[model samples]
Target chain A: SFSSSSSCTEEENKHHMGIDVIIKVTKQDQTPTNDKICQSVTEVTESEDESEEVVKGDPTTYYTVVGGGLTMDFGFTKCPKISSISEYSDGNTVNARLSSVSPGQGKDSPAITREEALSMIKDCEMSINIKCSEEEKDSNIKTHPVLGSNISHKKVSYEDIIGSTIVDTKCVKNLEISVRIGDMCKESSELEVKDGFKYVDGSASEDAADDTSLINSAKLIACV
Target chain B: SFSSSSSCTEEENKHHMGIDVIIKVTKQDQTPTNDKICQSVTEVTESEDESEEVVKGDPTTYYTVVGGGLTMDFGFTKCPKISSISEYSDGNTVNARLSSVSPGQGKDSPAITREEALSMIKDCEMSINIKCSEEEKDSNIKTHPVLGSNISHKKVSYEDIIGSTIVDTKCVKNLEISVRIGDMCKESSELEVKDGFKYVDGSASEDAADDTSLINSAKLIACV
Candidate 1:
């Protein structure tokens, strides 16, 4: 016979889990360009050791495009690190330290925090497409894509671009970056050349064959 | 000539804004079914008047399906109200009062809060699809789709299903709900009938023509 109430021993099991961050950078063009500069994954786990290594493997090499050709080489002196995962009313924000790598530059690159990166990504205009209805088209009413739709639509933030070196490249021109955590994925706005590398004041490039001149005058459009 | 630095009075601008919540419930099967039960949009604005109108217009009527045919009529006694928008570590949670409108039910139906509805949504299994690799198929190794991929993948929560009458219907047997805020959108899992509306156990329905019997025994799969 079994007793109505029986004494039992309670056992506990423990397990450790971590988040995997996969980053992929590709050209932002209509044609399927196989030129991917960076395609890497990083793992971040919860631990008591705050000084644990955050980034692994060698930095990816990025070749900049100028005058429709690869011109300058760029590499990350420091990779991004997820300092903290902040919970917000909107969603989980991955706060991290951003790395700045530029063409013709080696180690000792500049860096910024996640907040500063947010400001930069918010300010940069990646691309612009116009649309109009039949009536609007007939009327010649111009309509611009809504602000924050390209970049913020996918939940891409400064955290995604923190540790990258090159923002754009030749084969990888019009760069697009995506960050994935578990089933959730966020994509960055297309980093396209504003006005096709024209002069700042709407004038065309004088030295069309000069890679340096084209690269120096290149500017990303201003986005809200 | 204009003065380089001139004293000027600063002016402030004020504006009123609100969010529009569009609710659409359509069939869940592969064939696009236009049997939509509820298609409405509600506007919620920030105001000090706690008693301000949340839900407008008449309640949506939902008809249930049994034995592949329409059976009963249902309507909401009370509609869902967005009580508050709470901040979270993951994302913004739309806290609201969940209305329960069941088949053959009228006003004075049961209701739950957002937290309670969350538990229900978390426990309910909407649908499941199996997958296997070529090697796995040859080896007869079965693989199940990851948990939370279907329902939670779209960030759908209790707030979306609140204040709805019919869960499933004949033409609209499978239901999908999507909630949009600004550029962000969240979708609910497909509410498919489990085991094709079989008996509670593995047995088939004795009176397949009995609408009440079939409707009572219908169960949704358990999802995490």
Candidate 2:
């Protein structure tokens, strides 16, 4: 008996899958904040997900492909004058401070000067939302803290797959993130702050932290 | 003197680079052709060149990232009843036949039956164009041939970065491609034919190659 393996029939078996990532950063305001400084969005389909790491100047800044083209990478770099970082389970968010006291440092002698302290009275808060089948749902997020080798190093050095934080100027480095919805997964390139402060001669420092600056919010979604 | 390392100023130094790829295949007509069967396009930026390969259903069906995001991958799969392949240096095009004689095969007893040969009288031709500085320029193309383990193997096995060919039903395998302009490079996932023919009991066979089917044309462009 004659048989056929024609791809014309097999073409029906080919399904499409894709992921989208969006990141936004807005300046905080006492009223309603609308001053958006940074905004980026990307979408990749199963046929478009070529295995290549996106790199942002910094050596450690890049994204890796996971699973199928169901996940894509979205990332950026910043140099925040962070003092502390913390995680919360209730809302699946990570919170950090641009000005705070270290473990051994006293409040009266804050790690940063009064001007730097005033520039960042509000803490930096990050939130991630994922949408796939039903609608957008918040997933549990985590953080990993890393210490930079030097004050001028600009790499994001967080050690976990879902979270990251920074403290002082050189204590905690950068953040890397990943999210998974069933068989689909999305990864963020290293996000790090590289501005707002200056260090001279290793000891002398100057701060230019802006009071209105806020943290970035990212969203990732996948669909079959 | 006071100095600033504010990312606000550094943001201006961040430049953007991207690449776009488009591939189109149309069925040939006696007069003018407009019957497009397969069309695909993709764009990737320097920030999105995450080093990850895009894989089709076949294991060898994938793409690799090179240099910056100045390049992206655009690919597909097909199965043609090819008989021979040839390349021309003048137009920088790769041409193949759905029905031709192998060097050792006889003309009377063609590798394929007369009915199967009739399904593919017209040859398959491919052309590539690149645009960056000027509008568009044609680059020299090359093809590598590969033999599949068996007739049922679906992976594209061409060994070159530009062109490929298939002889008979299983002699030549598939095609892979790559292109570069200045500091940017674009790569294509494996493009292969996987339809139109069948094998049974390792000897019995059938053909469905359409005479109107034309080869795919691909274009890649990068910008800073």
Judging by TM-score against the true structure, name the best candidate. Answer: 2
lDDT of 1 by residue, B85-198 (tens): 111010111111112222111222223333443343333221111111111111111133211111111221123222212222223322222221111012213321111122
lDDT of 2 by residue, A197-219 (tens): 22221232223333222233112
Cα-based RMSD of candidate 1: 27.8
Candidate 1 regions with alpha-carbon error over 4 angstroms: A1-224, B1-15, B27-224
DockQ for candidate 1, please give it: 0.01
TM-score of chain B, candidates 1 onward in order: 0.19, 0.17
Listed in order, each prediction's TM-score against the native is 0.15, 0.20
* Clash totals for all candidate models: 6, 22
Misplaced by over 4 Å in model 2 are A1-36, A40-173, A180-224, B1-224
State the displacement of the C-alpha of residue B190, model 2, in Å, after optimal TM-score superposition. 22
The CA lDDT at B161 in model 1 is 23
Which pairs of residues collide in model 1?
A: A89-B92, A90-B92, A91-B91, A99-A162, B28-B174, B125-B223
Worst 10 residues of 1 chain B by lDDT: B86-95
